[PDB]
């Protein structure tokens, strides 16, 4: 087939960079993050939509691997979020060990340049995102350390409200979009060079963040409200604000977001959604956000990570130009990451003040007097 | 003075690398880790034994900055250790921001090579240690992430027992040295290339770790039991085991560890302790571990970080050779870090199994059957 040869050539020329894959949580589910002597199973998994053989077979160029942990179910919500932070480090650790152990297939990447050098070496550029601010345990310090561990996007919520923003699937609303803390955090995310992810957040939270952010954002895995009404899909109002933001909506493979009858969802629906967004807000603002392994079963023709050539072929068959297909494959999300880096270097370069955690005083006034008195004794020595 | 000119030349030729400084906890105490617009105060502090001006004045070559947090005082010891992990990330964050904000004075280092290139650039090589395994919240995954954030040594305890080892200052003993978990952790610390620190640990814990470790260890800030009996000082038995281990005892400036009458402790006592150890186990196994800012007041002649030239001068005056002084200044701790790297590359190269956290099952048996059945449906597609 000439269209399938074309698709393969495109997958060789530029990377397909997928916005969301929960393979790391499948590794927690199945192996409990103990992958010692499990290579054969990592290449050919007994469960799930991802493994190292099928990953190569789909000619995928890059992947934001999700370091998701569930919303905390502890009745003490302080201890729940603290437990989530620890679980987040467990997920980042298994992601890093997965990459370190299979260096011929996976190569860690945290930038536009490192995506490209990984792709030129024939490897799947392996980036990291966290799926909810419940994972940082109310600590902006923790967030910056997650960034330093390779986290490059932060989904603001999962399916739970947090101190910063409202999730889409939970009602009643807590903050009615972003909180006051949340608004401050947008600035800090821009300042540190963390990509903002608006998937799972409420329509109002999206609107507010899209107005506030000084860097482009993504939807790592969301589809299009006008084609299928769901709290998790992007309204025309927020697609418009995404255009002005210069961001990317990475179209989702979740059947519940593609069609009213989940079991009728199909490869064609994913293409319908890509083409809807590309037509209306431009093909430079749409990408691919599978959310593979955040689902049991995928749509017909997109059952697992081996099916990406079928999506590329499908888009070309519907008259999307090579150049535009290359954009939705990967170029757009690379641009956003590039612009997120540039905005952070600009703000750090201007010497913008970083957000600091509210800490308890550890010293009483007696200790502070002891310390200042001791300092002056040292000053008076000569 | 010709001896002071000699000392200055030595401080230019090789780095003085100090084993322990709690300036980061002073920054938490005084600023609550908010150093925005505080440069003038960071250069000339109103409290403590460390600031950026006095750091330059002492001609210090490198520093392991402590990311210490207190032993958890919560009656629920699960929530206490989880809180400590979060506080650890707060301390690592302020250390990293301190270094990033003053790049002409401080340069981050995590290796022998990065110490040297920092020293050749005229900067204080800034390494990181954590002071107790209470700080990792029973998570070996967290430990590896701390390593990836730049932590290069781990003091096994502070002044509290943990799941892994016994602190010196607490009785009764919990494990009687290391626990079974603790013995396993020694292997993992060797495997990941984390330097083991035996300061604050019990005499029995030291003996066991010194027998078990396949890489050299340090005492980041301990002095010599035979000169002054204290639970925190190193016995002749453990100095012997340190020699066979090939490790380094970094001599402490804490007055309580130098003399029975704290207020009589003096620069000469620090030199007595260095010379004791260097004479008996060799000058290649002794270093400098001030523990500045883990004390209110230091000994006469070693009041703050500007006093290092006096220590170098003091050692030369007592007939310690240039070459041996250069060793205790920095060469020895650099060797240990070098050997800790080499041992880790050897064990990772042999494909040694890494230690994994004991995790809860997240999926029941119904979910696993659903997932395996779904996998076979995908296998049967063609
Ligand atoms: Fe997910
Ligand atoms: Fe999701
Ligand atoms: Fe300390
Ligand atoms: Fe200490």
UniProtKB/Swiss-Prot annotation, chains A, B:
Provide the E.C. number(s) assigned to this enzyme.
Answer: 3.4.13.19
Enumerate the catalysed reactions. Answer: an L-aminoacyl-L-amino acid + H2O = 2 an L-alpha-amino acid
Asked whether the keyword Secreted is assigned, the reply is: no
Provide the binding site for substrate: 158, 232, 291
Q: Which cofactor does it need?
A: Zn(2+)
Tagged with keyword Zinc = yes
Q: Which cysteines are joined by disulfide bonds?
A: 71-160
Pathway in which the depicted protein is active: Mycotoxin biosynthesis
**UniProt function note:** Dipeptidase; part of the gene cluster that mediates the biosynthesis of gliotoxin, a member of the epipolythiodioxopiperazine (ETP) class of toxins characterized by a disulfide bridged cyclic dipeptide. The first step in gliotoxin biosynthesis is the condensation of serine and phenylalanine to form the cyclo-L-phenylalanyl-L-serine diketopiperazine (DKP) by the NRPS gliP. GliP is also able to produce the DKP cyclo-L-tryptophanyl-L-serine, suggesting that the substrate specificity of the first adenylation (A) domain in gliP is sufficiently relaxed to accommodate both L-Phe and L-Trp.
How is this protein named in the record? Dipeptidase gliJ
What is the species listed in this Swiss-Prot or TrEMBL entry?
A: Aspergillus fumigatus (strain ATCC MYA-4609 / CBS 101355 / FGSC A1100 / Af293) (Neosartorya fumigata)
What is the name of the gene encoding this protein? gliJ
């Amino acid at each position: 087939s000439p269209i399938e040869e074309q698709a393969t050539r495109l997958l060789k020329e530029v990377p397909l960079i997928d916005g969301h894959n929960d393979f790391p949580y499948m590794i927690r589910g199945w192996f409990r993050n103990d992958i010692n002597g499990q290579d054969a199973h990592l290449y050919d998994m007994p469960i799930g939509q991802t493994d190292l053989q099928r990953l190569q077979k789909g000619l995928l160029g890059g992947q934001f691997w999700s370091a998701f942990v569930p919303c905390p179910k502890n009745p003490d919500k302080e201890v729940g979020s603290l437990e989530a932070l620890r679980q987040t480090l467990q997920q980042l650790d298994v992601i890093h060990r997965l990459i370190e152990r299979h260096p011929t297939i996976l190569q860690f990447a945290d930038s536009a340049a490192s995506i490209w050098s990984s792709f030129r070496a024939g490897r799947v550029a392996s980036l990291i995102g966290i799926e909810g601010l419940h994972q940082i345990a109310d600590s902006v310090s923790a967030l910056r350390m997650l960034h330093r561990l390779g986290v490059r996007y932060v989904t603001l919520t999962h399916n739970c409200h947090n101190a910063f923003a409202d999730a889409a699937t939970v009602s009643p609303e807590l903050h009615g979009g972003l909180s006051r803390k949340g608004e401050r955090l947008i600035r800090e995310l821009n300042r540190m060079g963390m990509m903002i992810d608006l998937s799972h957040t409420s329509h109002e939270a999206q609107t507010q963040a899209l107005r506030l952010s000084r860097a482009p954002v993504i939807y790592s895995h969301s589809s299009i409200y006008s084609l299928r009404a769901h709290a998790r899909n992007v309204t025309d109002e927020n697609l418009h604000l995404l255009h002005r933001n210069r961001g990317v909506v990475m179209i989702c493979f979740l059947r519940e977001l593609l069609a009213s009858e989940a079991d009728q969802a199909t490869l064609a629906h994913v293409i319908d959604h890509i083409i809807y967004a590309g037509t209306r807000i431009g093909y430079e603002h749409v990408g691919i956000g599978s959310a593979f392994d955040g689902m049991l079963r995928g749509p017909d023709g997109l059952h697992d990570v081996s099916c990406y050539p079928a999506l590329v072929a499908g888009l070309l068959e519907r008259g999307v130009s090579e150049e535009d297909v290359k954009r939705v494959m990967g170029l757009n999300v690379i641009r956003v990451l590039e612009e997120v880096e540039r905005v952070a270097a600009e703000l750090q370069g201007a010497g913008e003040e970083c957000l600091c955690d509210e800490l308890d005083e550890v010293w009483n006034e007696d200790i502070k007097e002891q310390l200042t008195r001791e300092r002056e004794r040292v000053r008076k020595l000569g």
